[PDB]
Protein backbone atom coordinates (compact mmCIF):
# COMPACT_ATOMS: atom_id res chain seq x y z
CA UNK A 1 0.00 0.00 0.00
CA UNK A 2 0.86 3.61 0.61
CA UNK A 3 0.76 5.15 4.10
CA UNK A 4 -1.68 7.96 3.05
CA UNK A 5 -4.46 7.29 0.69
CA UNK A 6 -4.17 8.32 -2.94
CA UNK A 7 -6.73 9.31 -5.59
CA UNK A 8 -3.90 9.04 -8.00
CA UNK A 9 -5.13 9.73 -11.53
CA UNK A 10 -7.19 12.85 -10.56
CA UNK A 11 -5.98 14.60 -7.33
CA UNK A 12 -2.53 13.04 -6.38
CA UNK A 13 0.84 11.95 -7.72
CA UNK A 14 2.85 9.37 -6.02
CA UNK A 15 6.24 7.58 -6.16
CA UNK A 16 7.97 5.43 -3.56
CA UNK A 17 11.58 4.24 -3.19
CA UNK A 18 12.54 0.78 -1.95
CA UNK A 19 15.77 -0.34 -0.21
CA UNK A 20 17.78 2.91 -0.46
CA UNK A 21 20.97 2.43 1.68
CA UNK A 22 20.67 5.68 3.60
CA UNK A 23 20.60 6.70 7.34
CA UNK A 24 17.08 6.74 8.97
CA UNK A 25 18.03 9.80 10.97
CA UNK A 26 18.79 11.81 7.92
CA UNK A 27 15.59 10.63 6.31
CA UNK A 28 13.59 11.99 9.39
CA UNK A 29 15.08 15.40 9.20
CA UNK A 30 14.39 15.76 5.49
CA UNK A 31 10.76 14.44 5.55
CA UNK A 32 9.82 16.66 8.42
CA UNK A 33 11.42 19.78 6.76
CA UNK A 34 9.92 19.21 3.17
CA UNK A 35 6.28 18.58 4.27
CA UNK A 36 3.86 21.39 3.61
CA UNK A 37 5.95 23.06 0.90
CA UNK A 38 5.34 23.07 -2.86
CA UNK A 39 7.39 20.72 -5.18
CA UNK A 40 9.33 23.67 -6.68
CA UNK A 41 10.43 24.87 -3.27
CA UNK A 42 11.46 21.27 -2.41
CA UNK A 43 13.73 21.32 -5.48
CA UNK A 44 15.30 24.47 -4.32
CA UNK A 45 15.84 23.23 -0.77
CA UNK A 46 17.63 20.08 -2.06
CA UNK A 47 19.96 21.94 -4.43
CA UNK A 48 21.40 24.23 -1.64
CA UNK A 49 21.92 21.23 0.71
CA UNK A 50 24.00 19.47 -2.00
CA UNK A 51 26.14 22.60 -2.43
CA UNK A 52 26.74 22.42 1.38
CA UNK A 53 25.44 25.85 1.97
CA UNK A 54 22.21 25.12 3.69
CA UNK A 55 22.28 22.93 6.84
CA UNK A 56 19.13 21.04 7.66
CA UNK A 57 18.55 21.14 11.34
CA UNK A 58 18.29 18.07 13.38
CA UNK A 59 15.23 18.73 15.62
CA UNK A 60 14.47 15.11 16.07
CA UNK A 61 18.02 14.10 17.33
CA UNK A 62 20.50 16.48 18.83
CA UNK A 63 23.57 14.60 19.87
CA UNK A 64 27.25 15.37 19.29
CA UNK A 65 27.21 18.12 16.70
CA UNK A 66 28.22 21.77 16.91
CA UNK A 67 26.10 24.83 16.46
CA UNK A 68 25.67 26.59 13.11
CA UNK A 69 25.13 30.31 12.00
CA UNK A 70 22.09 32.30 13.31
CA UNK A 71 18.53 31.16 13.94
CA UNK A 72 17.11 27.82 14.88
CA UNK A 73 18.70 25.02 16.80
CA UNK A 74 22.38 24.51 16.64
CA UNK A 75 22.75 20.78 15.83
CA UNK A 76 22.27 20.05 12.04
CA UNK A 77 23.99 18.40 9.08
CA UNK A 78 24.00 18.21 5.25
CA UNK A 79 22.43 14.93 4.17
CA UNK A 80 24.01 14.82 0.79
CA UNK A 81 23.10 11.28 -0.17
CA UNK A 82 19.58 11.57 0.91
CA UNK A 83 19.21 14.92 -0.84
CA UNK A 84 20.44 13.37 -4.20
CA UNK A 85 18.08 10.26 -3.77
CA UNK A 86 14.92 12.32 -3.03
CA UNK A 87 15.63 14.49 -6.12
CA UNK A 88 15.17 11.45 -8.36
CA UNK A 89 11.87 10.71 -6.70
CA UNK A 90 10.80 14.32 -7.33
CA UNK A 91 11.64 14.11 -11.00
CA UNK A 92 9.55 10.90 -11.22
CA UNK A 93 6.61 12.41 -9.38
CA UNK A 94 6.62 15.36 -11.75
CA UNK A 95 6.86 13.04 -14.90
CA UNK A 96 3.93 10.89 -13.66
CA UNK A 97 2.10 14.11 -12.93
CA UNK A 98 2.45 15.32 -16.59
CA UNK A 99 0.85 11.98 -17.86
CA UNK A 100 -2.12 12.01 -15.47
CA UNK A 101 -2.98 15.55 -16.61
CA UNK A 102 -2.09 17.03 -13.30
CA UNK A 103 -0.29 20.42 -13.16
CA UNK A 104 3.41 19.35 -12.49
CA UNK A 105 4.49 22.78 -11.23
CA UNK A 106 2.14 23.57 -8.36
CA UNK A 107 1.58 20.43 -6.40
CA UNK A 108 1.99 20.80 -2.60
CA UNK A 109 3.56 18.01 -0.52
CA UNK A 110 0.85 16.97 2.01
CA UNK A 111 2.61 14.00 3.22
CA UNK A 112 6.14 12.63 3.13
CA UNK A 113 7.25 10.02 5.56
CA UNK A 114 10.14 7.59 6.05
CA UNK A 115 10.17 3.84 6.88
CA UNK A 116 12.81 1.59 8.56
CA UNK A 117 13.22 -1.45 6.22
CA UNK A 118 15.41 -4.53 6.37
CA UNK A 119 18.96 -4.21 7.69
CA UNK A 120 21.91 -5.27 5.50
CA UNK A 121 24.28 -6.85 8.07
CA UNK A 122 27.76 -8.35 8.16
CA UNK A 123 30.99 -8.38 10.14
CA UNK A 124 33.98 -6.26 10.64
CA UNK A 125 37.01 -7.38 12.84
CA UNK A 126 37.73 -5.84 16.18
CA UNK A 127 40.47 -6.87 18.57
CA UNK A 128 41.03 -10.20 20.51
CA UNK A 129 39.98 -12.37 17.56
CA UNK A 130 36.38 -11.11 17.91
CA UNK A 131 34.10 -9.98 15.10
CA UNK A 132 31.42 -7.21 15.67
CA UNK A 133 28.41 -6.27 13.52
CA UNK A 134 29.03 -3.84 10.68
CA UNK A 135 25.59 -2.87 9.41
CA UNK A 136 24.00 -0.42 7.05
CA UNK A 137 20.23 0.27 7.47
CA UNK A 138 18.01 0.26 4.35
CA UNK A 139 15.12 2.54 4.30
CA UNK A 140 11.97 2.82 2.23
CA UNK A 141 10.60 6.36 1.70
CA UNK A 142 7.28 7.39 0.07
CA UNK A 143 6.16 10.74 -1.39
CA UNK A 144 2.60 11.88 -2.10
CA UNK A 145 1.74 15.29 -3.60
CA UNK A 146 -1.79 16.76 -3.91
CA UNK A 147 -3.15 19.59 -6.06
CA UNK A 148 -3.84 23.18 -4.88
CA UNK A 149 -7.23 23.84 -3.16
CA UNK A 150 -8.96 26.94 -1.57
CA UNK B 1 -9.51 -41.08 45.35
CA UNK B 2 -8.25 -41.21 49.04
CA UNK B 3 -11.49 -39.56 50.02
CA UNK B 4 -14.97 -40.94 50.73
CA UNK B 5 -17.84 -41.44 48.43
CA UNK B 6 -19.70 -44.61 47.54
CA UNK B 7 -20.08 -45.40 43.94
CA UNK B 8 -22.49 -48.23 44.28
CA UNK B 9 -25.83 -46.57 43.42
CA UNK B 10 -27.81 -49.21 45.33
CA UNK B 11 -26.14 -48.22 48.51
CA UNK B 12 -26.88 -44.58 47.84
CA UNK B 13 -30.54 -45.21 47.03
CA UNK B 14 -30.80 -47.07 50.41
CA UNK B 15 -29.01 -44.23 52.43
CA UNK B 16 -31.44 -41.69 50.94
CA UNK B 17 -34.35 -43.90 51.96
CA UNK B 18 -33.22 -44.11 55.60
CA UNK B 19 -33.30 -40.27 55.83
CA UNK B 20 -37.01 -40.01 54.69
CA UNK B 21 -38.01 -42.39 57.51
CA UNK B 22 -35.89 -40.46 60.05
CA UNK B 23 -37.60 -36.98 59.49
CA UNK B 24 -41.19 -38.35 59.00
CA UNK B 25 -41.64 -40.74 61.91
CA UNK B 26 -38.93 -38.79 63.77
CA UNK B 27 -37.44 -42.03 65.36
CA UNK B 28 -33.74 -42.62 65.89
CA UNK B 29 -32.88 -46.16 64.42
CA UNK B 30 -33.01 -45.43 60.66
CA UNK B 31 -30.73 -42.42 61.18
CA UNK B 32 -28.27 -44.68 63.07
CA UNK B 33 -28.36 -47.35 60.27
CA UNK B 34 -27.55 -44.63 57.52
CA UNK B 35 -24.38 -43.48 59.39
CA UNK B 36 -23.17 -47.04 59.69
CA UNK B 37 -23.46 -47.39 55.90
CA UNK B 38 -21.63 -44.15 55.46
CA UNK B 39 -18.61 -45.43 57.39
CA UNK B 40 -15.92 -47.37 55.36
CA UNK B 41 -16.28 -50.82 53.90
CA UNK B 42 -13.81 -52.17 56.54
CA UNK B 43 -15.84 -50.27 59.05
CA UNK B 44 -19.08 -51.88 57.72
CA UNK B 45 -20.40 -54.68 59.86
CA UNK B 46 -18.80 -58.13 59.69
CA UNK B 47 -21.17 -60.41 61.52
CA UNK B 48 -20.49 -64.20 61.92
CA UNK B 49 -23.37 -66.74 62.26
CA UNK B 50 -21.76 -68.18 65.42
CA UNK B 51 -21.65 -64.65 66.72
CA UNK B 52 -25.48 -64.49 65.98
CA UNK B 53 -25.88 -67.70 67.96
CA UNK B 54 -23.70 -66.29 70.81
CA UNK B 55 -25.40 -62.96 71.23
CA UNK B 56 -28.85 -61.86 70.31
CA UNK B 57 -32.26 -61.94 72.01
CA UNK B 58 -34.37 -64.76 70.39
CA UNK B 59 -37.44 -63.99 68.18
CA UNK B 60 -36.48 -60.33 67.52
CA UNK B 61 -35.45 -58.26 64.45
CA UNK B 62 -31.67 -58.01 63.77
CA UNK B 63 -30.36 -55.20 61.51
CA UNK B 64 -26.79 -55.74 60.13
CA UNK B 65 -25.05 -52.87 58.19
CA UNK B 66 -22.67 -55.06 56.48
CA UNK B 67 -22.30 -58.75 55.34
CA UNK B 68 -23.35 -61.87 57.25
CA UNK B 69 -20.59 -64.56 57.04
CA UNK B 70 -21.62 -68.20 57.21
CA UNK B 71 -20.20 -71.77 57.65
CA UNK B 72 -20.71 -71.76 61.37
CA UNK B 73 -23.48 -73.11 63.69
CA UNK B 74 -26.77 -71.33 64.40
CA UNK B 75 -30.09 -72.61 65.80
CA UNK B 76 -31.20 -69.40 67.40
CA UNK B 77 -34.45 -68.20 65.86
CA UNK B 78 -34.00 -64.58 64.97
CA UNK B 79 -35.12 -62.84 61.75
CA UNK B 80 -32.44 -60.90 59.97
CA UNK B 81 -32.65 -57.94 57.57
CA UNK B 82 -29.26 -56.97 56.21
CA UNK B 83 -27.22 -55.07 53.64
CA UNK B 84 -25.59 -58.20 52.33
CA UNK B 85 -25.60 -61.91 53.02
CA UNK B 86 -23.04 -64.53 51.84
CA UNK B 87 -24.51 -67.30 49.69
CA UNK B 88 -23.61 -69.79 52.38
CA UNK B 89 -24.99 -67.53 55.07
CA UNK B 90 -28.30 -66.70 53.29
CA UNK B 91 -29.40 -70.49 53.29
CA UNK B 92 -28.65 -70.86 57.07
CA UNK B 93 -31.04 -68.05 58.31
CA UNK B 94 -33.95 -69.82 56.42
CA UNK B 95 -33.15 -73.11 58.04
CA UNK B 96 -32.03 -72.37 61.60
CA UNK B 97 -33.23 -68.77 61.97
CA UNK B 98 -36.34 -66.81 61.14
CA UNK B 99 -35.30 -66.07 57.54
CA UNK B 100 -33.12 -63.92 55.26
CA UNK B 101 -34.66 -60.89 53.66
CA UNK B 102 -33.07 -57.67 52.39
CA UNK B 103 -32.77 -54.53 54.52
CA UNK B 104 -35.15 -52.71 52.24
CA UNK B 105 -38.27 -54.85 53.09
CA UNK B 106 -37.79 -54.08 56.83
CA UNK B 107 -39.56 -50.76 55.94
CA UNK B 108 -42.56 -53.03 55.42
CA UNK B 109 -42.00 -54.91 58.77
CA UNK B 110 -41.74 -51.94 61.08
CA UNK B 111 -42.32 -48.53 59.41
CA UNK B 112 -40.83 -46.78 62.50
CA UNK B 113 -39.19 -49.82 64.40
CA UNK B 114 -40.31 -51.94 67.34
CA UNK B 115 -38.24 -54.51 69.21
CA UNK B 116 -35.39 -54.11 66.69
CA UNK B 117 -31.77 -53.97 67.83
CA UNK B 118 -28.84 -52.86 65.63
CA UNK B 119 -26.09 -55.51 65.71
CA UNK B 120 -22.53 -54.62 64.86
CA UNK C 1 -34.95 -3.47 33.43
CA UNK C 2 -34.98 -6.53 35.76
CA UNK C 3 -35.74 -4.87 39.09
CA UNK C 4 -35.07 -1.41 40.52
CA UNK C 5 -32.85 -2.57 43.30
CA UNK C 6 -30.96 -4.88 40.79
CA UNK C 7 -30.52 -2.04 38.28
CA UNK C 8 -29.00 0.13 41.10
CA UNK C 9 -26.58 -2.59 42.41
CA UNK C 10 -25.17 -3.70 39.07
CA UNK C 11 -24.61 0.01 38.32
CA UNK C 12 -22.97 0.54 41.80
CA UNK C 13 -20.58 -2.43 41.05
CA UNK C 14 -19.59 -1.37 37.52
CA UNK C 15 -18.86 2.14 38.71
CA UNK C 16 -16.89 1.08 41.77
CA UNK C 17 -15.20 -1.80 39.76
CA UNK C 18 -13.74 -4.98 41.15
CA UNK C 19 -9.85 -5.52 41.58
CA UNK C 20 -7.33 -5.01 38.74
CA UNK C 21 -6.84 -8.75 38.60
CA UNK C 22 -3.15 -8.59 38.00
CA UNK C 23 -1.04 -8.29 41.07
CA UNK C 24 1.33 -5.19 41.24
CA UNK C 25 3.08 -3.82 38.15
CA UNK C 26 2.01 -4.21 34.56
CA UNK C 27 2.16 -0.73 32.99
CA UNK C 28 5.84 -0.94 33.62
CA UNK C 29 6.43 -4.62 32.64
CA UNK C 30 4.75 -6.38 29.77
CA UNK C 31 6.92 -9.22 31.10
CA UNK C 32 4.21 -9.79 33.63
CA UNK C 33 0.86 -10.23 32.27
CA UNK C 34 -1.84 -8.29 30.57
CA UNK C 35 -4.35 -6.67 33.07
CA UNK C 36 -6.54 -9.93 33.05
CA UNK C 37 -5.35 -13.28 34.54
CA UNK C 38 -4.66 -12.97 38.29
CA UNK C 39 -1.77 -14.79 39.73
CA UNK C 40 -1.74 -15.81 43.41
CA UNK C 41 0.76 -14.01 45.47
CA UNK C 42 4.12 -15.73 45.22
CA UNK C 43 6.34 -12.87 46.74
CA UNK C 44 7.81 -12.17 50.16
CA UNK C 45 8.12 -8.42 49.18
CA UNK C 46 4.50 -8.21 48.21
CA UNK C 47 2.82 -5.05 49.37
CA UNK C 48 -0.49 -6.19 47.84
CA UNK C 49 -0.55 -9.32 50.13
CA UNK C 50 -0.15 -7.15 53.25
CA UNK C 51 -2.89 -4.76 51.93
CA UNK C 52 -0.93 -1.62 51.60
CA UNK C 53 -2.45 2.00 51.30
CA UNK C 54 -2.18 3.39 47.80
CA UNK C 55 -2.21 -0.12 46.18
CA UNK C 56 -5.63 -1.51 45.52
CA UNK C 57 -8.19 -3.96 46.93
CA UNK C 58 -7.09 -7.69 47.07
CA UNK C 59 -9.42 -10.39 45.54
CA UNK C 60 -11.49 -11.91 48.52
CA UNK C 61 -14.50 -14.09 48.96
CA UNK C 62 -16.50 -11.08 49.84
CA UNK C 63 -16.66 -9.59 46.35
CA UNK C 64 -19.17 -12.13 45.14
CA UNK C 65 -22.29 -10.74 43.67
CA UNK C 66 -25.97 -11.81 44.49
CA UNK C 67 -27.09 -15.06 42.97
CA UNK C 68 -29.47 -13.37 40.58
CA UNK C 69 -26.70 -11.21 39.04
CA UNK C 70 -24.16 -14.16 39.17
CA UNK C 71 -23.70 -16.74 36.38
CA UNK C 72 -25.81 -14.54 33.95
CA UNK C 73 -25.82 -11.33 32.09
CA UNK C 74 -27.35 -8.65 34.38
CA UNK C 75 -30.81 -8.55 32.66
CA UNK C 76 -31.27 -12.13 33.97
CA UNK C 77 -31.24 -13.93 30.60
CA UNK C 78 -29.19 -17.18 29.98
CA UNK C 79 -27.22 -17.52 26.88
CA UNK C 80 -27.43 -20.53 24.42
CA UNK C 81 -25.18 -20.93 21.39
CA UNK C 82 -27.34 -21.97 18.61
CA UNK C 83 -25.70 -23.24 15.46
CA UNK C 84 -28.63 -25.03 13.94
CA UNK C 85 -32.34 -25.18 13.75
CA UNK C 86 -32.70 -28.14 16.13
CA UNK C 87 -30.79 -26.50 18.92
CA UNK C 88 -33.25 -23.52 18.93
CA UNK C 89 -36.19 -25.48 20.27
CA UNK C 90 -36.69 -25.35 24.00
CA UNK C 91 -35.61 -21.62 24.28
CA UNK C 92 -38.10 -19.14 25.72
CA UNK C 93 -38.37 -15.30 25.81
CA UNK C 94 -39.19 -15.86 29.45
CA UNK C 95 -35.55 -16.58 30.49
CA UNK C 96 -33.42 -17.32 27.47
CA UNK C 97 -31.55 -15.22 25.02
CA UNK C 98 -30.09 -16.74 21.88
CA UNK C 99 -26.63 -16.09 20.35
CA UNK C 100 -26.05 -16.62 16.59
CA UNK C 101 -22.54 -17.74 15.92
CA UNK C 102 -20.08 -16.36 13.26
CA UNK C 103 -19.82 -19.73 11.50
CA UNK C 104 -23.49 -20.33 10.67
CA UNK C 105 -24.38 -20.51 6.92
CA UNK C 106 -26.99 -18.17 5.54
CA UNK C 107 -29.33 -21.02 4.57
CA UNK C 108 -29.67 -22.45 8.03
CA UNK C 109 -29.48 -18.90 9.59
CA UNK C 110 -32.62 -17.74 7.64
CA UNK C 111 -34.37 -20.58 9.31
CA UNK C 112 -32.85 -19.86 12.75
CA UNK C 113 -33.88 -16.15 12.85
CA UNK C 114 -37.39 -16.69 11.43
CA UNK C 115 -38.17 -19.34 14.08
CA UNK C 116 -36.49 -17.18 16.72
CA UNK C 117 -38.77 -14.18 16.08
CA UNK C 118 -41.72 -16.54 16.19
CA UNK C 119 -40.44 -17.85 19.50
CA UNK C 120 -40.20 -14.25 20.79
CA UNK C 121 -36.43 -14.67 21.38
CA UNK C 122 -34.28 -11.59 21.67
CA UNK C 123 -31.21 -11.58 19.48
CA UNK C 124 -27.79 -9.83 19.42
CA UNK C 125 -28.41 -7.46 16.62
CA UNK C 126 -31.07 -7.11 13.81
CA UNK C 127 -31.82 -9.52 12.03
Amino acid sequence: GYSFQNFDPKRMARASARDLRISPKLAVEVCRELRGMMLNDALRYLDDVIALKRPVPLKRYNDSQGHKPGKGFGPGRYPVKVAKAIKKVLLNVKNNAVQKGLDPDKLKIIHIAAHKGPVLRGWYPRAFGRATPFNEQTTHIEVVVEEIRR
Amino acid sequence: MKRTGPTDPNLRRLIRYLRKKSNEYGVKIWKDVAWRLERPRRQRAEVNVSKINRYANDGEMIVVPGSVLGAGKLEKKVIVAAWKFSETARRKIIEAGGEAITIEELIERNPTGSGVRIME
Amino acid sequence: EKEFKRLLRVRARLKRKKPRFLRQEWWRYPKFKNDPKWRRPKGIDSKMRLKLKGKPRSPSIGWSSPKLVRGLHPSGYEEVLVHNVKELEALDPKRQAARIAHTVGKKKRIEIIKRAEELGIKVLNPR
Binding site: - | - | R40, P41, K42, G43
Partner: protein, 74 residues
Protein backbone atom coordinates in the same frame (compact mmCIF):
# COMPACT_ATOMS: atom_id res chain seq x y z
CA UNK D 1 -6.45 -39.62 37.23
CA UNK D 2 -4.78 -37.45 39.77
CA UNK D 3 -1.05 -36.87 39.31
CA UNK D 4 1.65 -35.79 41.66
CA UNK D 5 1.88 -32.53 39.73
CA UNK D 6 -1.95 -32.08 40.15
CA UNK D 7 -1.60 -32.40 43.93
CA UNK D 8 1.43 -29.88 44.03
CA UNK D 9 -0.56 -27.55 41.77
CA UNK D 10 1.71 -24.72 40.69
CA UNK D 11 1.32 -23.69 44.17
CA UNK D 12 1.96 -20.71 46.44
CA UNK D 13 5.54 -19.78 45.16
CA UNK D 14 6.75 -22.22 47.74
CA UNK D 15 9.33 -23.18 45.20
CA UNK D 16 10.00 -26.55 47.03
CA UNK D 17 6.56 -27.88 47.24
CA UNK D 18 5.93 -29.47 50.68
CA UNK D 19 9.50 -30.06 51.79
CA UNK D 20 9.94 -26.56 53.31
CA UNK D 21 13.40 -25.09 52.36
CA UNK D 22 14.87 -25.42 48.87
CA UNK D 23 18.31 -25.98 50.43
CA UNK D 24 17.41 -29.30 52.12
CA UNK D 25 16.10 -30.92 49.11
CA UNK D 26 19.02 -30.68 46.71
CA UNK D 27 20.56 -34.06 47.03
CA UNK D 28 21.20 -37.19 49.26
CA UNK D 29 22.97 -35.50 52.21
CA UNK D 30 19.54 -34.00 52.82
CA UNK D 31 18.12 -37.47 53.70
CA UNK D 32 20.85 -37.97 56.05
CA UNK D 33 22.50 -40.41 53.59
CA UNK D 34 21.31 -42.86 51.00
CA UNK D 35 19.92 -46.34 51.99
CA UNK D 36 19.69 -47.52 55.61
CA UNK D 37 22.83 -45.61 56.53
CA UNK D 38 24.42 -47.72 59.32
CA UNK D 39 22.89 -49.45 62.31
CA UNK D 40 25.48 -51.47 64.36
CA UNK D 41 27.82 -48.71 63.25
CA UNK D 42 29.96 -47.08 65.86
CA UNK D 43 29.08 -43.57 64.45
CA UNK D 44 25.46 -42.61 64.98
CA UNK D 45 25.04 -41.69 61.35
CA UNK D 46 21.44 -42.96 61.55
CA UNK D 47 20.69 -42.57 65.31
CA UNK D 48 17.25 -43.47 66.22
CA UNK D 49 15.48 -45.76 63.76
CA UNK D 50 12.25 -44.73 62.07
CA UNK D 51 10.35 -45.86 65.23
CA UNK D 52 10.94 -44.18 68.56
CA UNK D 53 13.25 -47.09 69.64
CA UNK D 54 16.71 -46.25 68.88
CA UNK D 55 18.11 -48.07 66.67
CA UNK D 56 16.87 -51.62 66.73
CA UNK D 57 19.63 -54.09 65.96
CA UNK D 58 20.37 -57.27 64.05
CA UNK D 59 22.94 -60.11 64.35
CA UNK D 60 21.26 -62.24 66.99
CA UNK D 61 21.21 -65.95 66.67
CA UNK D 62 19.53 -69.26 66.99
CA UNK D 63 19.99 -72.19 64.44
CA UNK D 64 17.71 -73.27 61.69
CA UNK D 65 18.08 -76.95 60.94
CA UNK D 66 18.62 -78.13 57.35
CA UNK D 67 15.28 -77.81 55.33
CA UNK D 68 15.11 -81.60 54.74
CA UNK D 69 15.17 -82.72 58.45
CA UNK D 70 12.51 -80.05 59.41
CA UNK D 71 8.86 -80.60 59.34
CA UNK D 72 6.28 -77.93 60.39
CA UNK D 73 3.06 -79.80 60.89
CA UNK D 74 -0.14 -78.63 59.22
Amino acid sequence: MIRRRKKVRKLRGSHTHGWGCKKKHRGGGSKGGRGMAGTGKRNKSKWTWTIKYAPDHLGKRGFSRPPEVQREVR
